[PDB]
Enzyme design. Structure first.
Site, short mmCIF file in Angstrom:
data_model
loop_
_atom_site.label_atom_id
_atom_site.label_comp_id
_atom_site.label_asym_id
_atom_site.label_seq_id
_atom_site.Cartn_x
_atom_site.Cartn_y
_atom_site.Cartn_z
N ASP A 146 -58.32 38.66 -108.64
CA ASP A 146 -56.98 39.10 -108.68
C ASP A 146 -56.41 39.09 -110.26
O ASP A 146 -55.84 38.15 -110.41
CB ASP A 146 -56.17 38.35 -107.63
N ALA A 206 -61.71 46.39 -95.38
CA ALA A 206 -60.55 46.60 -94.33
C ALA A 206 -59.34 46.72 -95.27
O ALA A 206 -58.32 46.30 -94.73
CB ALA A 206 -60.54 45.55 -93.40
N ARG A 208 -57.96 49.78 -97.99
CA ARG A 208 -57.68 51.24 -97.80
C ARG A 208 -59.06 51.95 -98.13
O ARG A 208 -59.78 51.55 -99.03
CB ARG A 208 -56.44 51.69 -98.83
N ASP A 232 -63.34 49.30 -92.07
CA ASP A 232 -62.37 49.37 -90.99
C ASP A 232 -61.44 50.47 -91.67
O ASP A 232 -60.45 51.28 -90.81
CB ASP A 232 -61.55 48.41 -90.68
N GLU A 237 -59.39 59.48 -93.29
CA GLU A 237 -58.88 59.28 -91.93
C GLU A 237 -57.78 60.40 -91.63
O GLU A 237 -57.07 60.63 -92.50
CB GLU A 237 -58.14 57.87 -92.03
N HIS A 254 -59.44 51.68 -88.42
CA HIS A 254 -58.33 51.08 -89.14
C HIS A 254 -57.41 50.56 -88.21
O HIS A 254 -56.27 50.49 -87.96
CB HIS A 254 -57.56 52.38 -89.86
N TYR A 258 -54.59 45.17 -86.47
CA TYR A 258 -54.04 45.65 -84.73
C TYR A 258 -53.82 44.57 -83.67
O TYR A 258 -53.67 45.10 -82.59
CB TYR A 258 -54.38 46.99 -84.41
N1 NAD Z 1 -57.15 47.62 -91.97
C1 NAD Z 1 -55.86 47.30 -91.79
O1 NAD Z 1 -55.65 47.28 -90.55
C2 NAD Z 1 -54.98 46.62 -92.74
C3 NAD Z 1 -53.97 45.77 -92.24
C4 NAD Z 1 -52.99 45.21 -93.22
C5 NAD Z 1 -53.35 45.60 -94.66
N2 NAD Z 1 -54.13 46.29 -94.98
C6 NAD Z 1 -54.42 46.52 -96.31
O2 NAD Z 1 -55.07 45.25 -97.31
C7 NAD Z 1 -54.93 45.50 -98.59
C8 NAD Z 1 -53.91 44.43 -99.10
O3 NAD Z 1 -52.87 43.98 -98.27
P1 NAD Z 1 -51.93 42.68 -98.54
O4 NAD Z 1 -50.97 42.91 -97.31
O5 NAD Z 1 -52.73 41.71 -98.88
O6 NAD Z 1 -51.27 43.44 -99.97
P2 NAD Z 1 -50.59 42.35 -101.11
O7 NAD Z 1 -50.01 43.28 -102.02
O8 NAD Z 1 -50.05 41.17 -100.67
O9 NAD Z 1 -52.21 41.83 -101.76
C9 NAD Z 1 -52.88 42.63 -102.64
C10 NAD Z 1 -53.50 41.57 -103.63
O10 NAD Z 1 -54.40 42.70 -104.37
C11 NAD Z 1 -54.04 42.21 -105.82
N3 NAD Z 1 -54.86 43.30 -106.92
C12 NAD Z 1 -54.14 44.43 -107.01
N4 NAD Z 1 -54.90 45.14 -107.88
C13 NAD Z 1 -56.14 44.46 -108.01
C14 NAD Z 1 -57.46 44.73 -108.53
N5 NAD Z 1 -57.47 45.84 -109.23
N6 NAD Z 1 -58.36 43.78 -108.43
C15 NAD Z 1 -58.02 42.70 -107.64
N7 NAD Z 1 -57.08 42.44 -106.96
C16 NAD Z 1 -55.71 43.35 -107.26
C17 NAD Z 1 -52.53 42.03 -106.01
O11 NAD Z 1 -52.36 41.10 -107.01
C18 NAD Z 1 -52.32 41.23 -104.77
O12 NAD Z 1 -52.48 39.89 -104.96
C19 NAD Z 1 -53.56 46.86 -98.71
O13 NAD Z 1 -54.44 48.12 -99.04
C20 NAD Z 1 -53.27 47.03 -97.28
O14 NAD Z 1 -52.87 48.44 -96.98
C21 NAD Z 1 -55.03 46.75 -94.23
#
Ligand code: NAD
Ligand code: NAD
Lengths: 380, 380
Positions: A146, A206, A208, A232, A237, A254, A258
């Site tokens: 991160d 899971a 994007r 996921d 999509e 996705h 949920y």
């Molecule tokens: N599949 C699902 O049903 C589902 C559900 C909720 C969230 N998500 C996805 O999960 C992902 C993360 O969600 P979140 O709520 O934890 O977001 P968040 O913003 O809280 O956390 C994302 C983390 O990624 C880090 N980051 C950014 N660029 C990076 C890189 N190049 N390398 C490593 N780390 C990096 C950021 O510093 C941050 O700490 C998002 O894409 C969100 O859309 C998917």
């Protein structure tokens, strides 16, 4: 107070009824004319909440989950004196449960001890940060990539993406999809990085879809790559690649996030910030609004193998293999039917609870207590 | 007495130490030479208890808990005044739990409601009769085919094979393997019967390999037959047909009846029979040697979906998908490797409990109590 909520947002009345009048409209049907009698606005990522959109309205509070603070005009909100809630991790815990379920399925096809695996979490925010503390709570080796968090936390132990890929045999992705900026994440896993994955490596995505090069992944697997893959999230999509899905161990539409709690928690968290802003006590909780869980709890005897307890606990609440089976059936028709089926699975997603809600008796056994605590479940 | 036992037979000391001397031997090393000094003989299926082996020896009692009684010369025992026990049903309930787990797997892949199926049980003895009782207890539609039982119990509810096969869309087989007689069972499911199965029919075989025509089944499944198949028993064991196995939803190395308590019950039932033969009171029981469960129990809230509860309860104890995963891996090498890998999974089968030992609280919900009692789990 005069409230306007995107119609898709649940449980607005339960939280905001005694707070004033509530009005509900479709997301993109909320514009300048609608905002003219609105004090508190509750939206998703569809409604516009910019300067252009908001100026000239009595809007004093903007609440959302789906939109990050990177995509909110916070400097404008400050200028105009508008309060805001960008509720962090509304649907985060559900994704943690999904990954755990995937790891269990993966360990089972492979006959692997999960405790001997080397985990690599790319992106450690709301989701990834929760995953990390579960894995570490169990005593497992976790490498965290991160770069942003690393720059703000000089005392924490973080690794580079290329070291993670060098040392991890289990990868889970939890970054946003950033095409630009300082650290871009589109195809963060491209053909050369995917092709370099050592035989018997596991991959969970899971986050994007476009964080993984889906077409490279498909061809690499068709070519006979020795991997376990859980996806996921997909590149096109609701049009998931069906030849890629057939090669994934776990393939779901996705729905990782949920959970029943995750769909209602957004409203709850916005309401909490709304109470914090107004300087008022909370009148209604997430608990108040959630239906009773189906599985209250589970009792383990102290002789129980810890690894057996872990799998039993997670799967009792949620096994994504059930969602995987429903997804395979959704992939039988033509492009147009597969797309419609993808979205229908999401719309008709069954009630699913979170592991943190499970009550577990362990008979005082320390190693079992450690498992419950690491999972975030409740010791009773 | 002077006891000889197959060295794999558990808890002989707890049940027999008070009866005299105890010698052990590998199964195949038991013959007339080895039997000179033996009054009580305890065996497994791997040793022949024949006229040639027993003539002149002082063996007066024979006990076994295994697959069938084909290794016993029951005519000779009746002639020679030798008492015996096959401990009927010693390993029966594990097979029931196995079938239930298969139905759950099959419903999940097909998206089927278990309550809407028509169940055909072919052979309703120790295993089949237990299965029938579970299925009926749940309120599901059941057809029973058992011509020997029907002829002896004419006021019962039985049906012909032909009609069962026409009406049922879930078939589970629990007959012995009989080459001759009025009701022979070798290839009871043959090419024409398998071919006439209603599309979408589920077939479970955890009886004996040759009850189903494996080659004909394989060709039908290759030909695109609309069927789900779960096999625990194979023609050619330990040489399972790997092309057949690949087309089975569930495939396992003849371990359906390998629950931990089955092995204990075998010795315990033999002892009960031995006590009757000697005309003495029973002193030791199964409870004296039975280990505590790892999972004590589950607590369901009154509002739990009954169908979800059934799936959760069964799987919490035993899901045969786990054994299927281990079995897939055993099918990777050459013929000799697959054969040995098949036996290795049976010999080193992991600890596995029975659904009947699970304690379930339901909040006094009648639909849930019905599920628990039908399953034979313990209502608390
Ligand atoms: N599949 C699902 O049903 C589902 C559900 C909720 C969230 N998500 C996805 O999960 C992902 C993360 O969600 P979140 O709520 O934890 O977001 P968040 O913003 O809280 O956390 C994302 C983390 O990624 C880090 N980051 C950014 N660029 C990076 C890189 N190049 N390398 C490593 N780390 C990096 C950021 O510093 C941050 O700490 C998002 O894409 C969100 O859309 C998917
Ligand atoms: N896979 C395993 O781990 C496992 C474990 C235990 C038993 N088994 C097998 O399951 C089968 C049944 O075991 P059981 O202990 O219930 O035996 P059992 O003798 O108690 O029951 C067999 C029943 O089949 C009936 N039957 C005989 N011929 C029939 C026919 N032509 N059509 C229909 N029914 C017929 C008999 O009347 C009897 O009621 C046996 O083949 C046994 O070897 C497998």
């Amino acid at each position: 107070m005069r409230i306007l909520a995107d119609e898709n947002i649940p449980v607005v009345d339960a939280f905001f009824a005694d707070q004033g009048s509530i009005r509900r409209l479709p997301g993109r049907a909320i514009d300048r004319a609608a905002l003219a009698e609105v004090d508190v606005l509750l939206v998703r990522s569809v409604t516009e909440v910019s300067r252009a959109a908001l100026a000239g309205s009595p809007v004093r509070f903007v609440g959302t989950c789906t939109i990050g603070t990177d995509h909110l005009d916070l400097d404008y909100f400050a200028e105009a004196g508008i309060a805001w809630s960008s509720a962090p991790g509304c649907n985060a815990r559900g994704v943690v449960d999904y990954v755990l379920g995937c790891l269990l399925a993966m360990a089972e096809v492979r006959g692997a001890d999960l405790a001997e695996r080397t985990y690599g979490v790319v992106g450690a925010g709301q989701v990834g940060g929760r995953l990390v503390e579960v894995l570490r709570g169990l005593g497992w080796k976790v490498l965290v990539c991160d770069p942003p968090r690393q720059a703000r936390e000089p005392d924490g132990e973080f690794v580079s993406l290329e070291r993670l890929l060098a040392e991890a045999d289990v990868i889970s992705l939890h970054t946003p999809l950033n095409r630009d900026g300082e650290h871009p994440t589109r195809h963060l896993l491209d053909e050369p990085r995917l092709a370099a994955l050592r035989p018997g490596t596991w991959l969970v995505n899971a986050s994007r879809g476009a964080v993984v090069d889906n077409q490279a992944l498909r061809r690499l697997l068709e070519g006979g790559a020795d991997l376990e893959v859980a996806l996921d999230v997909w590149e096109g999509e609701p049009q998931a690649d069906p030849e890629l899905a057939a090669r994934c161990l776990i393939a779901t539409p996705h729905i990782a996030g949920y959970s029943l709690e995750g769909k209602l928690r957004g409203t709850a968290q916005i309401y909490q910030a709304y109470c914090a802003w107004r300087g008022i006590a909370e009148r209604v909780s997430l608990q108040d609004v959630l239906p009773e869980t189906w599985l209250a709890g589970l009792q383990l005897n102290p002789g129980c193998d810890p690894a057996w307890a872990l799998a039993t606990l997670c799967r009792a609440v949620y096994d994504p293999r059930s969602d995987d089976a429903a997804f395979r059936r959704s992939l039988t028709g033509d492009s147009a039917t597969r797309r419609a089926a993808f979205d229908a699975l999401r719309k008709h997603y069954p009630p699913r609870r979170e592991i943190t809600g499970l009550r577990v008796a362990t008979g005082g056994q320390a190693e079992l207590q450690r498992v419950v605590r690491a999972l975030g479940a409740q010791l009773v």
